[PDB]
């Protein structure tokens, strides 16, 4: 696709042409609030007599479902100060930089981190540095330490004797998690090891079981041929703990402060949803939803899946 085609010949380095070595980078951590880790370059790259310096924003992740947000000021967003700013990769965040041998080269982020969520838009604009900001959400599980980079380089912008700075983002993901409570309805090996239950193609009504507790993450890799699903906007509670308002049907309605990731199932690559039960929620709740498939190619028999979600069933 044009959103993520990689140029295999592209080459660069962390320092670029600044001649600065890493021991002289101005290194600092991302500003982290809740589960959003933000690198904001809006005021870090303006030209100064001392320029160009290297501003390295370090994003260190060893927890699940962290959203990474990177803001790079736009050319002409302020007169003169960013006339020659460049960002790399141009197709961030779908394409990132990783170190191969000793240089930075382009890599598909979704191939690097299975289950990673790239939404098409940010603030109702394209998720691309051309609009000033990119975002992505790391998955509930990462098996291998992973390091990749973004460049927001204002070092070629000149204003009087002053030069802008070269901004680097280093995202350093340490391994975290093991397996998502839930089911994968079945490169392929990545799919088979990511969820606790693998539902291989069946021609009947078959049950997936997602057992969760306070603080747990669950998720589902939905079938390829999905037509319709009530997971998780139209849940049906069973077992009679409390009285049920039939309009309080989403997991949000039923579990205060629960979060569903990729509700719109509009993230690229991965036909997944993740759910997070908050640590505050201590009540017991058994829920049900369903997945219906398209009969595009008939097997003479229709496929459907029942998804059972039990919360705090202890």
């Amino acid at each position, epitope marked *: 696709d044009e959103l993520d085609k990689i140029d295999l010949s592209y080459e660069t380095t962390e*320092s670029g042409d600044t001649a*600065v070595s890493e021991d002289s*980078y101005d290194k600092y951590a991302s500003n982290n609030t809740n589960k959003e880790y933000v690198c904001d370059f809006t005021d870090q790259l303006k030209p100064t007599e001392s320029g160009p310096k290297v501003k390295k924003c370090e994003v260190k992740v060893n927890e699940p479902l962290i959203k990474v947000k990177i803001i790079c000021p736009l050319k002409g967003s302020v007169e003169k100060l960013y006339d020659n700013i460049e960002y790399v990769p141009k197709k961030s965040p779908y394409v990132v930089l990783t170190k191969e041998e*000793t240089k930075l080269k382009e890599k598909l982020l979704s191939k690097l981190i299975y289950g990673l969520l790239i939404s098409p838009t940010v603030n109702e604009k394209e998720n691309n540095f051309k609009e000033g900001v990119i975002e992505f959400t790391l998955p509930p599980v990462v098996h291998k*330490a992973t390091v990749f980079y973004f460049i927001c380089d204002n070092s070629k912008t000149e204003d009087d004797n002053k030069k802008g700075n070269r901004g680097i983002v280093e995202v350093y993901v340490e391994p975290y998690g093991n397996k998502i409570n839930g089911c994968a309805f079945l490169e392929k090996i990545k799919m088979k090891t990511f969820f606790t239950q693998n539902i291989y193609k069946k021609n009947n009504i078959y049950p997936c079981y997602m057992k969760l507790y306070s603080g747990d993450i669950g998720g589902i890799l939905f079938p390829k041929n999905i037509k319709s699903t009530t997971c998780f906007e139209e849940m049906i509670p069973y077992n009679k703990e409390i009285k049920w308002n039939k309009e309080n049907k989403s997991l949000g309605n039923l579990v205060n402060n629960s979060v569903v990731y990729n509700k719109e199932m509009n993230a690229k690559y991965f036909n997944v949803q993740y759910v997070h039960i908050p640590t505050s929620y201590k009540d017991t709740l058994n829920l049900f939803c369903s997945i219906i498939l398209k009969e595009e190619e008939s097997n003479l028999i229709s496929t459907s899946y029942l998804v059972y979600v039990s919360i705090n069933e202890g």
Partner: single-chain antibody
Amino acid sequence: QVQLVQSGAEVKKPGSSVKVSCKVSGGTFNTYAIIWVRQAPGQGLEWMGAIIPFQDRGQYAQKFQGRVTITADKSTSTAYMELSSLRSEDTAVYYCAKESGRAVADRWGQGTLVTVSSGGSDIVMTQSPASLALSLGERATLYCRASHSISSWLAWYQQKPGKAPKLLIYKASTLESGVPSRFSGSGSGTEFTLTISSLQPDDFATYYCQQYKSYPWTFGQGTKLEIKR
């Protein structure tokens, strides 16, 4: 600043193994490549392999495949190189080095002497002249040719006897910090030059060019620049 300190000299019997350590202090360890280079006495520099510590796996020159293991201990910022089935020809000074965001190996250990006592499509670097005899204050011009196009991914190193290589120029023409301006580099593609505008006593040494376009990194056999008799 950044220091690489290696373990001390070793004497081994033929057929044995040796493990050399390289402790990095004052620089970031986990995300920058550590390389290992050896130099047989009186001979040139030879790339053996590299590791980016967070990856938990090294890369090796085919010449050493199956005899060399490169590892890194992140909690101590120490890299290791283990060479097995030692033979006489493995007698050499082994160097560790690291890159610092500019692709080139710009920080070097002091070297470890190891004494043994009882491929196709690689880029070939050709230096000339093999020897230069010049007087103080004269200009020196050194040449380096690559068998394949390497754009400007070429470095120049100065080595004094017994000492580790010292980076002078990287990206063909960029001076390393602290290097006097009488050193200059030129060229791109396959032909490169190092010029010393006016020779001073400190400038007499062996100079090596090195392509760092692609592994295995390869060195020219050096130009020995000595005082005119």
